[model samples]
Structure formats: C-alpha cells, structure tokens
Target chain A: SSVRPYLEECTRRFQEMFDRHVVTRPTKVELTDAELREVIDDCNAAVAPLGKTVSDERWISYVGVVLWSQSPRHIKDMEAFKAVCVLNCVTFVWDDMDPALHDFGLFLPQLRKICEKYYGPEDAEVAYEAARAFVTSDHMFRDSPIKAALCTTSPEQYFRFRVTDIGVDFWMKMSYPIYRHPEFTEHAKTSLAARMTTRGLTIVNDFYSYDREVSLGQITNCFRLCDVSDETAFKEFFQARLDDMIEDIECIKAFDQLTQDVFLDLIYGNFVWTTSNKRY
Target chain B: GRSSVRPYLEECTRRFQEMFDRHVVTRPTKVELTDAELREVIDDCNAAVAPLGKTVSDERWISYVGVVLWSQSPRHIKDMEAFKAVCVLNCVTFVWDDMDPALHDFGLFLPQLRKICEKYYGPEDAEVAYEAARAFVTSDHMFRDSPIKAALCTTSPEQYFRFRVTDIGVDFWMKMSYPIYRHPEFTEHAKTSLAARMTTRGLTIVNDFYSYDREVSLGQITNCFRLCDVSDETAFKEFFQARLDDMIEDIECIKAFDQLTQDVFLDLIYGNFVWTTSN
Candidate 1:
C-alpha cells in the first residue's frame, strides 16, 4: 500500500511538471494530416489511458519534462520515463516517418522497449519515440553511416548532452540493439537497421563525448528541426559540430573535433552585433 | 497422362540428361513430364517456398534464383547451403583473378589483419600463409563490398541523401555522410570515395529536371546525355555500339533480358506496392 501511494505521488508530480510546461496547445508543431492522426493515436497509446483506466495525469505531466526539460536533475524518476519515450518515438518515426529519416528510424524502438519493461508501456513509449526521432532526424544523424557501418561506431552524443550524467551502464545496455518497429521487418534488409544500431550506440557515445566537448546545454536544448536560411544554418552548424565531436571520440580522430572547433571559433570570432546587440 | 512410375522416371532422367548432354558435347533429348509428376514437382517447389510471405516482395520472389543473382537473403537453410557452394567457387576465382590487392583485402577487418600480421608476424610465417589467407578474404570480399554494405556504411551516399531531408539533420548527415559520397581526393561528391578515379572519356553530363510545387512533375533540364537527347536511330545505334568495348557481355545480357520480358508476360499472384504508382 505504501508503494502504491509512492507510485501515485511520483506520477502526480510528473504530471504537474508536464502540464506546467510540455505539450501546450500552441507549442505543438503543425503536422501533416497523416502525422496529426498518427500523433493522436500515439497519444492514446502513450499519454491517454486505456481500458476504462484512470488517465495517469502524472504520465502526461512527466512527458513534458522529458520533452522540454534541458536536463532534469531527477534521474531517479526521470530515467525510465525518458528511455521509454526515446524507444517509442524511434519506432513511431521509422514506421511512420521512414520517408524522412529512412530506416535510420529503428534505433529508439529497442531503447523504448527496454525502458518499457522497466517502467511499463504507459511510462516508456514517449521516451522511446522522442529520443529516437530526435537523434536520427537530428541534424548530425546524417553525418556518417558510411563510417558507422564500416566501423560500427555509435552516434548518440550529437543529440543528447552527457553520457556520464545518464550513467554508462544505461548507455551500454542500449548499444547495438535493434528497435522493434514494424517497418524494421522490411528495412532491416536495407542499411536502416545498421543505421539504427550505429546511431543508437553513437547517441550514448555522443553523450560521453559531450563531456569532452564541454557541451553546456542539456540534451533537450540540442535538437534538429526543419528550417531554412540563417536560423536553420546556425542550428545545423552547431548540431553538426556536436556530431563530429561524437565520431571523433569514438574513432579517436582529432581532425573531426579540430575541424568543428575551428569552425566554431571562426563563427564566433567574426560575430557581428546588430542594433539589438544580438550577435548575428 | 500416364501415372506409371516407369514413365515418370524416364522423364526425370531425360530432363537431367538435357543439361548433362550440353557439358558432355552430346545430343540432348526433349523430355515431357506427365501431368501427375508435373503436379507433384509444382507442389514440392511450392512447399519449399511456403515460408515466404504472401506478399511477393524481394525476399520471397528473387530467392528462387539461388545460383543466378547471388542475393542469398539467407532466410533458409537450403539457400544457405547453396551460398556455401557459391563461396567455394568464388575462392577459385579469387586465386586465378589475382585482381586488385585491396580487393583481396576486402574481408571484414582481414585487410587490417594482413597489415598487422605483416608488421607483427615473422616474415617466413607471414609469407607462407598470407597468400592463402588473402585469397580467402578476396572470396568473401564482394559480400562486404555489396551495395547494401555501402548503403550501410556510416558515411554512405544513401545516408547523405537521407540526412539532407531535415534542415538541421542535413549538416549532421553530411558529416557522417562523407565516406559514402565523398571523392577520395575530396573533389565534387561522388557515390563513394573510390569514385575519385572515375574521370573518363565517353561520359557526357547534362541534367534538366527540377521538381516544383503546384505540379508534381514540373521540372526543367539544363543538359542531358544521349539517353535523354536525340531519340534518333543513328545516335542510339552509335551510342549502344560504342559501349561494346567494355560492356559487350552486359549489353548482350540486357538484350536477352529484353527478349525474356517480351516472351513471358509476368504475372503476380499477390501483394501490393505501398506507395502510389501514379506519376
């Protein structure tokens, strides 16, 4: 009974944190009609409760933290939820967004599933999917399947911030695991499965690599999006540099890191301030 | 129409003899299968392929060509055995061909092994075993060099193309995407690093199409090679014949395939393409 109450309280705090921050009406991206419908289905599977079950308002609230939080200090409660969100998001994107990320979509499904067993499906789905999609479609995911396949190098660090902060054991458990996306059946024969495995490993590797890069921001602050012109390029450049950081760490190559830092200096050194004093 | 065992045995032996006769330089006999035996063979073949899914995708269909295309999806033990045979044949090819030393080095990490062995091992031992080991590596090299392998490489061309889809993802993809698409010397992007050597005569480059919204097919081309230009007969004949020097066998194979396409109107029993086929 004490355990039940404790679980209940944990769920409540997570929900409170979420509604206070994540998944607000206007903040959501404008999705294609198909994507919108799929997201609704995904919400039912993830956020909404099933089978006359009470809506775990706590689960919804926790998602916000997973989604928007740059770094949640509360790893004790947040780790399971975040991992599950990553897995589910990976499966969803590959199954649905394969045209965009290609088969690189399967990495998170395995991660989510692993978390799901630990936290239950209700807690795990969002973390699984969120992290998977965020990383593959992340700006840096595009960087190097060529080497990834040849070397089987991991690509996690480009998106997520710190591996040590997440714990190395958790990262190790995720390395080279296959995601359980439905599309994986078809795409597995293609390079997508390899992409998923390499990138999933790399995400963790990147997290550790981020420590060396002195990545100031949390994993949540690091994300790639569809945009264009100066704003898009700026995000693109940093995200790319971060990815190179991970590859350099894995292959023990300084060229990648040196190249990235050199570019960063060039960009910052030539920084011009507008009338608003914003560095352009 | 007879269901007699004698007739069926005769037919089976005759069919075997037809192919056997070719290699023996002898006359071949045409064999006719009895309806009952034909039905039995069809059922047997169908049973063999039963685990293949209802949707006739690449995994199901092309698997029948175990000796031909060399796809070997390796989903079944029977196919696995066939693949083993192919491997044995390829080993002989490797020894006789001698080919590119790197090609001989193409086994997964074997290239590194040879280098390590050379650097670390006794010279006499390395010399004795290196040639045989190198042949073995070359035999399986194509598996690692497969298009799928290229596509799977962390820095593959396909990944490069896929990474370009997202605004931010593009930059990251490009970094990882290099080995697949980068020229070895870092010239203009090509399919693989090895393609840096592909500069040659007889290749004319022109492009014309660019996709636009409001119309799915709306695009323009600036330049195009002979394929797109001059549907003229003389131009086509010359172009086709000019390829004979290096591509003669491939051209003949293509012509034979064209004939096969004309002769056999292929029929599909089941499955569907997921995407819309309309242009």
Candidate 2:
C-alpha cells in the first residue's frame, strides 16, 4: 500500500549507514554552492543548440536532476562540471530524438562545437567520443536487431551489455579518472556486486521512469522483461540487488575516500530524485 | 535421435537462399567485371599472398579464390585503390591465418599497415581508418593468443559471444566490408551491433564446425565446438540451427538501413559458407 514511503525509508537507511561509517572524505577541489548555480544558469542555457527537441519544461528537469542528483557536484571540480552540463544535455536530447533522422549522428557536429566554446579541444574531443558512443548506443537499441537477440540471453550477458549500454564509462571520465591498486578497476569489473552498482544507476531509472519509457514505444529496461511476475516480488528483488551493491562496495578496500562516497552518492541520488524530482 | 547434421545442412543453406531470393537479397548485388582487369587484380592478390621470393604452392593458395578472387563485392568497390588495399590485406590475412598460429605478430608492424589503410581509405580520413586498423590489431593479437587457451573451457553462445566476438575480430571484418562507414558518422549505429557481432560468431562457429574433424583430429582443443561443455558433432547441428535463428533475426535487422551495407554482409555470410560447404 505504501511502497513509496517504505522504499524511500530503505533508501534513507542506506544513506544513514553510509553516514555512520566513521572515516570522513573530502573533495579535492573546493567550491561553494554559489559557484555551482552559475554552471546551471549560463551553460545550461547553451545546452541544446537552439534547444532542438527539448521543451522548456523538460529542459528544466534534465538539467536540474543531472546537476544535483546524478552526480555529487562537489566531488568533481567546477571546471569539469561546467563541461558535463553540456555533455549530458546533448546526451539526453539525442536520446529524445528519433533515430529515423539518421544523419550520421546529426547532433554530433554541434556537440563538439559547444565543448570547444566553453573549454579546450581536449574536453571537446573527449565529449565528442563519449557523446558519439551514447548516440550510437541509442541507435543500436532502436535500429539494430541485436537488442531483441540480447534480451533473450542469460542475465550475466544482459546486464554486462547493459553496463556498457549507456556509456557511463565516458561520463565517469568526463570528470576525473582512475583508481588505487593495480588491476583494481579491472578486478572490480569482474565483480557482480560492483557491476550491479554500475548497472543500478540505469536500472534504478527504469523502475521509476518506466512509465515514461513504455510510452516512448519500446522499453529497454530489464525490470519488466526480468520475469519477476509483478512489482511485489520485483520491487523487493530490485532493492536487494541495489542493497547488495552498497554492501559490495564497502567490503572492497581498494577505493580511496572520495571514491567510496562518490559511488554511494550515485545510488543515493536516485533516492533523492525519485522521492522528489519533477521530471526527466 | 537422427543426427542434427544433414538436416542442418539443408535448412541452414536454404535460410541464406531464402534471403538471397529476396538483394540485401531482394535481388543479388550484381557487380560486372571484365576478364582482363579481373585477372590483373587476381594476380596481384595471389602474389600478395606469397610475397616477392616466396614459393607457396598454387594448391595451397588457389582454394582461397572464391573469396579474395572469385568474389562479387569488390567489383562494386569503384575505388581501385581501396579494392587493392583490402585485397592485399585479406591475402596477407590468408597467408598469416593459415600459418602455424605463431607465425608473425602484425601487432607492431600494423602501424605502417595502418598508415597504408588510412591513405587508401582516404574518404573516411585518418581517425576512422586508424581506429579500424587499430581494433583489428588488438583483436588480432588477442585472437592468436585467445584467452580461452589461457583461460572459459565451457560457455553459452551469449557468454562465448562476449569473448568470441572481439577475439574473432568481427568488428574489423564489418569495417573491412566498407571501410568508409567504420567512421562513426556513417554506420556507427550498426557497427558494433549484435547482428554484426553474432554474424561473425555464426561465421566462426560454423567455420569451427566445418573444420572441426580436421582441427580436432589434429589435436586442436581450441575450436568453438569444444569450447562449450562441448559442441560434439551434435552441437554443429544445434549451432547450425542457432546460426539460422540468428540470421533470421539478422535479416529483420539488416533490411532496415543501408542496402549495400546490408547486402555485403549477407554476401559475406553466405559466400563464406558456400566455400565451406564444398571441398
């Protein structure tokens, strides 16, 4: 009856567990809240090269949640965040565009141009690569027969494909890149819990934004096709998988202070958004 | 139980034929060529396979003709230079792939080869050609030293695909079909698509199946059939069916965009099999 409140409590409990963990972490580059809103106001205005398909109302949601929810704004520098503001806006809009337009990644020419506007070719080049990866990923879902073929496979492959499905790898690098200990990142990818942590970022969205996805024609989310029978079983099953991801991260010791918090914050961000945000 | 082999042979061959009656196959991609021009091209390709002073036998190299020489796709290539480059490259691939898997590492030598591919595939510019060749080298090395030998003794098509797709260099072959579109702008949407990845899987899996008795008889444990808990001759029957199931799924995917892009691969799959189907 009260899935919203109780599940919101489940999310809050995860954060509280993170809160009492004892070791404190700090952001490498410091900034005040005053600095961040500037990124949102100026760069977000330049977001859609003429706001293409994004309506005024949807732009507000795409920008705001990405700013405060998807990422922990302080963990990355204002310099990095400034660029992702454009990086993500293009990503969302391209996702919103229909693939039939198919002009060899039509949004790409301007995507690279905008990055160069705010930053150097260094940022523009990476944004172009990552953004290209994303749009192409979208094309695969809609245009290619691979999606349905992959859908029927075992979960290991399904989720593994889903892990790279979005291009989160690019998003992570858009900020800062690396890890402690040799082969730790490599070893981490091999971890089911670690990958589920990565997968949950999008999987979490499917459960909440599912209605939006269903109306969009074809849905790629695993929650529905996952064979759980209904939300009653699927809901708890989903939480446990997410909960397992949190436990897995805490158990692994290679991550540095900033990383531990940043990873947990990603999971927590969804909680805050679903419990509160207006739209996507 | 009846052996899954013969029925698979009939059914599998017919599936590609089904698509054939239909060009992408609504009708065949007919590339007209002259005997004089074709002979000159074939000599360069065969010589490219042997090199200047090398004495590889005609018997050893002649069978590869249905592919590099008897082929239909290259006639439509138009860019004489691009056609020459892919021919020399595939011929080199033939000589090398046929060698004792340890023959030579193209990994280091590839930078120069990369330079050549870029200049020849000039329409796509350096980055696309460079990355395409770059991916080929990475997969080539890993393919020769396949991690499975170093490592997954038993796996599913999906799991096998995760490793096999890249290790087999399926991505490279797609680009090899039309190097220009390897650039993200043109065919990125379908470049790394599952249809492309699994088509290679189907190709190599069937390749492994047809060549199985010989490879296994020679004591090669690395064949795709053996990689699953085992594709005993029975698995060939199952995998052949698996191959058709995948292509059925593939035609639905390919017919949607880029007819030539779509047709070339169908030609690749079917042509690759016809040679395999015979002696």
Candidate 3:
C-alpha cells in the first residue's frame, strides 16, 4: 500500500481554544514546606487512631500543591483550604493503604467485620463522603462481571471502569466546590465536563503513577488495557487522551458561560499541575 | 377495591415505562417458562405461556404486552430473569434485622444464599451475591445503637444520604441484577457514579413507597420510611419527587451513556420499578 503521487489522505479532525501553556513552567503552589508538613501532621494525628498515615514526604505536599494550583481561587481562603487539604490528605492515604485496591480477592472482610465501628468522621461531610466513596468504590470492583471482562477490556471500557475506580471521581471530590457555590458543586459531583476532565486527570495520573504502582505491585491502573508494552501503551493513551482533552473543551463550547469558565480552570489546573508533578 | 394510591402508582408506573422503553423494542414473552407434567413439578403458567394451538385469552396477551411496557429493553437476555432475582433478593435481604441479631446469623444465611445464587447464576458468580449480601448485614453492626437514623436521615440531606445510602441493603439488592445478565457497558458505578447512585436510590425509594402499604399497613415497622416524616402532605410527594427529579435531572445531565449503558440503566431504574409494582 503505497501513495505514489502528490496525495495526502487528510483526515480533518477539528479540535482546544484554552490550551496547556508550554511556558517552561514553575511549581504552582505557594505554601512553605512547614505549612505542608503541618497539613500532613494534623491529618496524620487525625487518622492514626483509625490506622492510616502517609510515610513519604513527597506526596502530601504534592497533593497540597496540586490543590492550590488547581483551585487557585478557592484555596485562597484558609478555612476552605484547611478542610479540603486535610480531607484530600486522608483521601490519599486511604488509597495508599487500600485494603482491597482491586476486587481480586485480597480482602478478608469477615475477619475485620468486627472491627467496623461507627462510620467515618461525622463532622466533615464531604470528607466522609469522599472516604466513603474511597471505601465504597473499593468494595465494588471485585464483583465478577467486571473482573471477567477485565482481560478483554477495550480502552474505553476500562476507562469507564476507572472512571468509577478511583482517581477522577474520588480524588476530584477533594476540591469539591466548597464556599463558592452549591448548585454547581452538586453538579460538579456528576457533570459531563467533570467526567471529561476526570479522564484528562486520570490520563496524567495513570501515565505518571505507572512506575510507583509497578514497584508496589499494583495492576489496577489504566496501563493494563493494551497488549503492547505499557510504556508504549501508556504513552499512546496519554497522547490520545491529550487529544481527547481538547475534544472535551470543544464539546463544552456551547454551555453556559460560567460552566465553561469552571471547566477551563479545572482543566488548566489539573493538567498544568499534574504535568509538573514528579514521581518515581 | 383498588386503593387510591393506585392512581399515583399507575402514574409513576406509566412514566417509568415510558422513559425506559424509549428507543427500544420489548418482548414480554422473551423467556417462556416450560410446561412440566410431572406430579412433583410446579408452575401451570409455563404451559399456558407457550401453548401450541391456542387462540389464548385476549387478557393474557394484553397482560404480556403490559409487562413489556414496564420492562421494554436492555438487550442481553430479554426476559424477567433479573426481575425475578430482585424479588428473591429483596425478600431475603428485607430480613437484615440488627435488633434481632440473636435470631439473625450470617452463619445461617451464607450457604442458602450461595445455593440460591448457584442455582440462578451457576457456581462461579454465586460468590458475588454472597459477598454483597454480607456487606449489608455488616452495616447492621455499623448501624447498631444509632438512634439518629432519623436525625441523620433528615437534617442535612448530604449526611442523611451519606448514612442512609449505606444502611439500606439496596447495594445487595442491586448486585442481584449483575449475575442475571451482562452488558459489557453495564452501569459500572455501583458505588462511584453519582447518577447511578441516584437511580439506585430512586429505585429503592420507589420500592420503599410501594412497600409501605403492605409492610406498614400490616403493622410491621420498616424504619426506612420511619427515617423520614413523609406523611406531611408535601412530605412524601414533594420530597419524593424532588429526589426523583434529581434522579431524572442527573441522568439527563450526563450525556456519555451510550445506548448500551442507557438501556442497562433503564433496566435498573424501570425494570425494578415494575418489579416493585407487580411484587
């Protein structure tokens, strides 16, 4: 199959108006190392009795940095930032020490059934829901129909599973619209734009988190959807996702002005910050 | 005598079928139960269903056509398999009594549940039903001693939803739908997707209301409705439909559900809606 003469099989796939800047970026957060440590320390003490903590220094701050970067406007207020930061910090460790990350039979729910006490922090409403989702979403993946389909998964199928799996919905809830407004906050909890960007975020997350997940022996990430090498599979998924991110931007073009504004900021912050985030 | 609730139930039943049956063909006679003549065997309805040379009653076919309207379409296995499974599940799970834990035993129910699932779904997936079954009863341990299932139920709707969502055994109830059929793109957000959560909540809310007359009218206390003061005229309808409206709005808002996912969601919402009505 050779194209011999002056011919271009031009496939016109039209696509992002507000794009990722290639300005040789700087870290997008403004907190001191001490401030980051305080957020970690408080959340550590808060969760230790319940048996959770973050051992590494890199991620607590990474979560905080990513938050401040992503929700630059929202995090300016200390109370909102404090609540979101502590909530997110715990959210990270919950995933960090996921009892049953995948539903691949790692859980011994019967033995620990007695240890179950009152549900999570009664005070922090959003935090409780996020962690509940963290725990709730964890329990479901082991159900057979999904697991049976795992090996034969198309990238889109696996992505839908992942959409429910962890990062995008679970993690994105951390920056859940706190003080700014409530209607769209509920809307954000399950909106189209929110779902689309979650793909964008998960692409960066699965792309970057591959190495650590490998060393820790985790197979739940998106890199498993292809037959080729994950390095290549993920790189392709990322580029393809990078292309799809713009597709979402273009799709949301006709929404209300405010919805588009919120979408653009969420997109810019997560991508810009996630790109800067360094991982092993 | 038809109850006055019949009108509203019919209204909802109509709307539920209308919404779900959109863009899909439904065959109520999809699974014809077989005729068995052995003395030990049961079910006369099967022989009647696929009769060889029958003009058949107009009402029988009319009833079949009506059944199709309630559960129009969700393609994989075009029948009442999951619908029937929901009945067995709801019946078994309605007994998760934390107050009577002495009589209630996970030890007792485990094997029977497994066998039921094994018969229905084969031995491989018998495990899923049991595990989901266990989570609900254990939430009993979690809900133990909490008197504020009411206060928590009402005050802040978020907190109400947070706890109410778990305490109900609907999670286990919904899982029964899985083994009956598999749509590769089935609503996978049993716990994650909010839209699916709303629909599941809507399905259960539909169940809770429909069951009120049978359970509450007979003098047994099902505290799910006790958790809400729904009798305030505006109480039931306004709040019920508001939550139901959330279900509709959220489903409408999310555009990504393909025909496959949409059909499955429809099956989840309306198929079960019909189940509650008929049961």
Model 3 spans > 4 angstroms off: A1-38, A50-56, A74-77, A98-123, A142-152, A172-174, A191-193, A211-217, A229-239, A253-261, A277-280, B1-191, B194-279
Q: Which ten residues in a row have the lowest lDDT in candidate 3 chain A?
A: A6-15
Cα-based lDDT at residue B32, candidate 3: 35
| Residue lDDT tens for model 2, B1-279 | 111234345665566566545534433233333665455545655554333334565455445544544333543454565555555455555665566655455543455556556656764434544455455444445434443322322334543444444445554555554552343323553333333453555467657666666666676544565643233656656655665565565545545435555555566665665566664
Residue B163 in candidate 2, Cα distance off native in Å: 2.3
Per-residue lDDT value at A91 in model 3 = 48
B156-220, model 1: which lDDT tens digit per residue? 22232222121111111111212221122221111111111111110111001111111122221
Candidate 3 clashing pairs, residues 3+ apart or interchain: A103-A142
lDDT of the candidates, in the order given: 0.27, 0.49, 0.46
> Residue B144, candidate 2: how far off, in angstroms?
6.3
For every candidate, C-alpha RMSD to the true structure in Å: 24.8, 8.1, 16.9
Please count the clashing residue pairs in each candidate, in the order shown: 61, 4, 1
Candidate 3: lDDT of A11? 10
